[PDB]
Amino acid sequence: AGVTGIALEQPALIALGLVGGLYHLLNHSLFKSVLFLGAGSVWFRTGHRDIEKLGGIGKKMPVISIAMLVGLMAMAALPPLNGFAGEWVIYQSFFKLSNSGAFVARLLGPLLAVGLAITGALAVMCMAKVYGVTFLGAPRTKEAENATCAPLLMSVSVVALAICCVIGGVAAPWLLPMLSAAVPLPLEPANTTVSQPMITLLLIACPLLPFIIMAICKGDRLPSRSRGAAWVCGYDHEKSMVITAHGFAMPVKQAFAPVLKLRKWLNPVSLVPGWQCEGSALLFRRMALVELAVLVVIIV
Amino acid sequence: KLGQHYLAALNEAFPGVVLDHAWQTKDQLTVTVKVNYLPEVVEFLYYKQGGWLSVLFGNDERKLNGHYAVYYVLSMEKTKCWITVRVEVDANKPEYPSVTPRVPAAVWGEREVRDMYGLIPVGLPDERRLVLPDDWPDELYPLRKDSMDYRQRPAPTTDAETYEFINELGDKKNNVVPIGPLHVTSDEPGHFRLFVDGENIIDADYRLFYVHRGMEKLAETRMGYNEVTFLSDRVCGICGFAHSTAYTTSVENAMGIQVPERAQMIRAILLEVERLHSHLLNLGLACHFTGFDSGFMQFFRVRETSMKMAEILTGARKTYGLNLIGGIRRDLLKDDMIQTRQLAQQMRREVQELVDVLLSTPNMEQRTVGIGRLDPEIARDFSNVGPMVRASGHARDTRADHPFVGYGLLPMEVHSEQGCDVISRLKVRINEVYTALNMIDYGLDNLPGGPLMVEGFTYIPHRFALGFAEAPRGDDIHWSMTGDNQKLYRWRCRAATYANWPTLRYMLRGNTVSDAPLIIGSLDPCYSCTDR
Ligand code: FCO
Ligand code: NI
């Protein structure tokens, strides 16, 4: 969007595209570090990387579970976190594209918005699946409940990264003009601002009202109990009956089948002659030692 | 005498195997064959002679002849008669050769005899427990006459279910979708395991007999002859008159009992009136999964006026009590009979308009075709009998082959379709509503008259026969042996859907999750009739 703006000589398009792109770059690096380090902590305490055989981690390590909840809600672009602001500026740049005078830009304007809505909804689904089959429900391996809490500095690093993610989320209106010092010109959303602090205040204070109402409308309410198993229509519950990532991602395989079959088609792996060699994997790492040793020394 | 030709064919195919043969009635025949030569005889009469394996069951005759008795009832339908194949299983080593590797319809009767009597069919592949619950102690065989008292209750071994479900086409990655035993709109306990990959059903196993009361043992211990007619009515609320007529005709065929003329065909009137009640309930449930609900409540309305003639011909709702061994209890009078005639006609008025729903044909063309297809090849092997086998192409009907309550004086029409879909089985039941309404139109205007009851007769001991009725879901075959003037030695009942159940694996295969309750209800199961 920024390159199209500098092609069309539209400074608002350049400003919106560049800061949206670079803000989303910084925010993505933050919450991706959150996600990778937390998944590594889960592997560190358990030993498994397959989410089919990784359930019930939210009760074993709750600090890590909260940190991955923040990271998943930050990556799937949800307000007021840091993955939503950059997508908002990118959508503003898309709307500036949709009003510029060009047939190649007006045709491409709303289509990018439609497909970015596709991508956001698919990301929301993917992180719903990831949090559901990993940090929620009963564990599906004996190796899972044996996992104790995360270490000290691992938890410190992941919580500090999540704190930075939340800070970059709510303080977007104070950090976006800081990035306006690099791409240097006025930011011109189309007559609209979004304000992450009021969404932040309106997402902690609004759920207090049903809490107050249930605190008022309760009479002889017994304390809430979490004792039994899930209701599976009279028969007892088994490990083969829970729905996991295999069964949760079936209608996307149902509706988006042509793209997933296009994955198999455009795969020119058999056309390379020396790809199936015995020692091709070791040969590549053998010349890798040669190449790094000869290119470092010529710089020094 | 009916059945001479089949006996001659069995004698020429097997020279010295028929140890004894006798006739129960003119159309009823039994043969005693050798134990080690049993599977060849029943397979011959099944495949070569075109016989259908109706019911097979054990017996406890250790104080009559010192041997167990396993019967094999076959229905000759190529004139048409009943052939029962009887074997004498040894007492201290109960083992007889199995039929399931040869006839697939012998898969649950030979699983029931493993549980009720403890007899061991050698070579049976499906050895899992069928009727007894999972907490039942092993060697207590209930239907053995000396294993336990009817009133004894063993301690449950386990609280959790220990049943094993097989996955023929799936693997260890497939998920399961329960549909029982406590499911809404099922209204009756029965577990199902849809081994699904997405919404598609790869395989389907099920656990049944959650409603196994154990009334086979109670009918021979605490209960007499006229009182089992109350037991047959309280099996299920919709086949009540089917079980009672099937049991009554088993005891009247066991003796002579020349029943009076109108007491036969009034049972034929009430047998068809009940299938107005049961088919229009299934057609209402057919619209509650196809989609429309204003097609269901309206089938509930035409079901109510079917319940209105059942209110006036008897005076009861659901479980009744109108048949005795000699004849019928309560008797119909003139205006009731003139009246039922045009309320039969106005239903044919109403039924025609409501059937204009499939003429509408939107969810009745995409949801109900290609869904739950029952192979006529498979239906012939497993001997299904209801609208399942009539949709699949076989004109199997008891009222045409074996007229039992004077159906020969009534206009009989057998309707068989060619497609095997859900919509094909609805078309069987739609044409059966008009057919039953023709009998009510032609039955109640030409009653022969005479008496109603024949009582005072003495029950000859150790006399048995087969009783049969055309239930709305197929036939129920009742085999009862008289014990004395008061009690029964043995009463065996097979439900209409008992033969129908072992083919649900081959319907639910290849279909979806969403229409799976429609496939189950397409054949209109009566769990309480089959669970006994
Ligand atoms: N129809 C019916 Fe009831 C069952 N199954 C009987 O017979
Ligand atoms: Ni029934």
PDB file of C-alpha atoms in Angstrom, chain A residues 231-236 238-244 246-247 250 254, chain B residues 160-161 163 165 174-176 178 180-183 191 193 197-198 210:
ATOM      1  CA  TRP A 231     -22.033 -34.694  29.558  1.00  0.00           C
ATOM      2  CA  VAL A 232     -21.729 -37.195  26.710  1.00  0.00           C
ATOM      3  CA  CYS A 233     -25.382 -38.341  26.673  1.00  0.00           C
ATOM      4  CA  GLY A 234     -25.502 -40.925  29.463  1.00  0.00           C
ATOM      5  CA  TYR A 235     -22.557 -43.137  28.484  1.00  0.00           C
ATOM      6  CA  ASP A 236     -19.281 -42.567  30.290  1.00  0.00           C
ATOM      7  CA  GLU A 238     -13.569 -41.601  26.948  1.00  0.00           C
ATOM      8  CA  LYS A 239     -10.306 -40.244  25.563  1.00  0.00           C
ATOM      9  CA  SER A 240     -11.396 -41.104  21.999  1.00  0.00           C
ATOM     10  CA  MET A 241     -14.525 -38.936  22.227  1.00  0.00           C
ATOM     11  CA  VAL A 242     -13.046 -35.453  22.762  1.00  0.00           C
ATOM     12  CA  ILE A 243     -12.820 -33.290  19.642  1.00  0.00           C
ATOM     13  CA  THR A 244      -9.283 -32.046  18.998  1.00  0.00           C
ATOM     14  CA  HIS A 246      -7.931 -33.154  13.889  1.00  0.00           C
ATOM     15  CA  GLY A 247     -11.713 -32.762  14.128  1.00  0.00           C
ATOM     16  CA  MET A 250     -12.471 -30.307   9.176  1.00  0.00           C
ATOM     17  CA  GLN A 254     -14.461 -29.036   3.688  1.00  0.00           C
TER      18      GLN A 254
ATOM     19  CA  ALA B 160     -18.739 -48.276  33.944  1.00  0.00           C
ATOM     20  CA  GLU B 161     -19.691 -49.858  30.635  1.00  0.00           C
ATOM     21  CA  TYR B 163     -18.699 -53.083  26.025  1.00  0.00           C
ATOM     22  CA  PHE B 165     -17.143 -51.456  19.865  1.00  0.00           C
ATOM     23  CA  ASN B 174     -11.472 -41.407  14.265  1.00  0.00           C
ATOM     24  CA  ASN B 175     -13.730 -39.608  16.733  1.00  0.00           C
ATOM     25  CA  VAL B 176     -17.079 -40.882  18.016  1.00  0.00           C
ATOM     26  CA  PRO B 178     -22.745 -40.742  20.806  1.00  0.00           C
ATOM     27  CA  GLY B 180     -27.507 -42.476  23.233  1.00  0.00           C
ATOM     28  CA  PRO B 181     -28.630 -43.736  25.583  1.00  0.00           C
ATOM     29  CA  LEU B 182     -29.913 -40.373  26.899  1.00  0.00           C
ATOM     30  CA  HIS B 183     -30.610 -38.322  23.768  1.00  0.00           C
ATOM     31  CA  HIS B 191     -26.423 -46.069  22.359  1.00  0.00           C
ATOM     32  CA  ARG B 193     -21.082 -44.884  18.121  1.00  0.00           C
ATOM     33  CA  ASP B 197     -14.038 -38.343  10.066  1.00  0.00           C
ATOM     34  CA  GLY B 198     -15.546 -34.861   9.778  1.00  0.00           C
ATOM     35  CA  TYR B 210     -30.760 -50.961  27.735  1.00  0.00           C
TER      36      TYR B 210
END
